Design a protein around this ligand. Sequence first.
Ligand SMILES: COCC(=O)N[C@H](C)c1ccccc1
Ligand SMILES: COCC(=O)N[C@H](C)c1ccccc1
Ligand SMILES: COCC(=O)N[C@H](C)c1ccccc1
Ligand SMILES: COCC(=O)N[C@H](C)c1ccccc1
Ligand SMILES: [Zn+2]
Ligand SMILES: [Zn+2]
Ligand SMILES: [Zn+2]
Ligand SMILES: [Zn+2]
Lengths: 362, 362
Amino acid sequence: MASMERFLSVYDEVQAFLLDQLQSKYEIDPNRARYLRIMMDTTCLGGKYFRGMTVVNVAEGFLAVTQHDEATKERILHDACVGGWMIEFLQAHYLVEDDIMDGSVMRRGKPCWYRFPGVTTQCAINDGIILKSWTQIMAWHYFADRPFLKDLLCLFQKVDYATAVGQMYDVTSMCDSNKLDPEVAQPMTTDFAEFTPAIYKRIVKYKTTFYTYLLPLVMGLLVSEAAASVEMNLVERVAHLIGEYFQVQDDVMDCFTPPEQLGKVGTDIEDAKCSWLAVTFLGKANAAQVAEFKANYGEKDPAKVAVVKRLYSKANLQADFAAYEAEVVREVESLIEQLKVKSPTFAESVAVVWEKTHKRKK
Amino acid sequence: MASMERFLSVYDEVQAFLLDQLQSKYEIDPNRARYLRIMMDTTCLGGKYFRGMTVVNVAEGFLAVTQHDEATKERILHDACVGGWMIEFLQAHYLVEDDIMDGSVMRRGKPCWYRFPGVTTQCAINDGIILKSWTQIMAWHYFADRPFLKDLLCLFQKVDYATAVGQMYDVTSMCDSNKLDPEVAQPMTTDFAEFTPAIYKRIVKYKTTFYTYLLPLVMGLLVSEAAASVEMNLVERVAHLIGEYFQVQDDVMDCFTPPEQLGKVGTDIEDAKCSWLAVTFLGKANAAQVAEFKANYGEKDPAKVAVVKRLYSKANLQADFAAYEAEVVREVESLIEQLKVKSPTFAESVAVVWEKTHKRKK
Ligand SMILES: COCC(=O)N[C@H](C)c1ccccc1
Ligand SMILES: COCC(=O)N[C@H](C)c1ccccc1
Ligand SMILES: COCC(=O)N[C@H](C)c1ccccc1
Ligand SMILES: COCC(=O)N[C@H](C)c1ccccc1
Ligand SMILES: [Zn+2]
Ligand SMILES: [Zn+2]
Ligand SMILES: [Zn+2]
Ligand SMILES: [Zn+2]
């Protein structure tokens, strides 16, 4: 069976499980089950499934080099698919809550879930809560007798918690740290002193890299009982590195990819986000460029946003991006080598992960 | 050491642990740690700690009848306090998210967390996420080598998930089930056909009774290694029964307790909630009373809300409440007896829990 078809089939199976349980254990009625069914489909389906499929790809790579009964290959691939949907549903929780937090309009060419007419914020906050709760129900049911259950639960919770802390770093990135204060309404920075490469790197490490790259790779090792084929410090290192590059790409597209192709109107500038573009611009600007940036960044006025886009265009940030890219190519290729000492297989999976990111066009 | 002082001391210990970890593992800076510290204090402290202290009370009752080394008594009471704060922090997650969902203003005489000037909804949704994440970090750290760790994690997740499903039942209780539909903006019921005792009971069972009464009692059994001193079906039965009574009290106070003493302006009527008062009123009203209720319920207009309060007052709902109360006194006293077959101790703890609820004046 082809991996994607397996993956999709298990979605159906998990969905039926979750909704049937609601009916047998939680007294749900047909109409609320249907609401939840729709919510699950709308919030979990329609992406590329890169995260979830990476768990399956990692587990297929070990199946090719490890001796097992056919029924054990099937059980490993079924566990890889369940674990991959745990990650997809965890992403769906974060996207639904993030979209409400940020006042987002669209995602992927469709309205954000909270904007659906019959959802509203009052239901959507709780729908997002439920999405994450469903990851736990999956694990306790499908993995109940598995040796990896503790490790997988403990990894998932650390990853979830990192991601929430990253969300906190992201949404406070345009404030001065020393002025954070629940009692006092928060002004936008005026100095941009915290728009640095290391502070950027912190935000991105936590907000995206743990759930997007670290979790899929490590979940694939866990469902395969293969965590001894790797040096975990290397897998963390490469995950964080590739995931940073991924976010840098996102940041560039937020500004420059036209909305119809982006699936969104990008507002990082108006939102005063600490984006790769802002940090890299500041890192090369002269005094007058810095002043013009300060006078225009973090405002809804479209003329001011255009002045920012103009400044970035004139600043030849494509060049700094090519330099960044070269350096990441270099470091990721080194880490893949350190990963071969223990597993060619695991290294190849990391190689694919890299190729898909590096060569992604959307 | 007195139980409450122990309990409070462990708060300090857990808080320090959580913030120190943020600094050693998650790259936090001092100012964001301080933000989180304040958020934890504001959202977790200032109640009666009834839920968390019930875990400690249940564990103290078993200590009086079970032989242990002093160091084991201390470890049990420390685990009971950690487990009690897991429950308090889980409540704090639900209160912060519920207040945003419902557009609440105050809680306990202070602004809701999201309304603080330097919080805002964008941070508060994620702060609530973090609150629940902290319950997991507590458990994996304090209970890492404990025999009850799996059982406690599995119970906590089922309770969390029930509570979210209860939130869904609560916020959709004024819509017709057969019209739920993410695509279509939801009208208020006009028939009130779903304002029934059984539908009420479902809402309350899930929204409040699992986290408020079932979880504290069962966590106390788990940290004591005492789940064989009970028949779990009875503990579930009594938890749900007492927790229903608790909510009925809340519902009555929402309408009739003056705001300064309530800590809140009550809006259940304007919000068209399926409250005990509405269900009980409908269950005794004549045709003209039902019509007047329909014409006035679920509106912000204060004249219409006063017409509802008037209808409830004239309807002698104190009498139906006394009848309800008598019946609950009767059934809870029976369950306490079935609970004595296996544990006098556990029965007494349930007795205290009941007394505190029955005789609570706030
Ligand atoms: C829609 O964008 C076209 C496009 O090639 N996007 C990819 C993802 C990309 C690569 C490198 C830097 C920025 C963006
Ligand atoms: C690929 O995105 C659309 C786009 O026009 N990007 C431009 C060429 C760019 C700017 C800054 C950094 C990298 C690339
Ligand atoms: C502030 O309310 C006074 C008061 O006694 N409240 C308690 C909680 C109560 C008991 C029974 C029914 C309703 C309310
Ligand atoms: C105790 O709350 C304040 C209050 O005036 N309550 C009244 C007496 C009441 C109405 C309906 C049901 C029970 C009690
Ligand atoms: Zn965001
Ligand atoms: Zn972006
Ligand atoms: Zn609510
Ligand atoms: Zn209430």
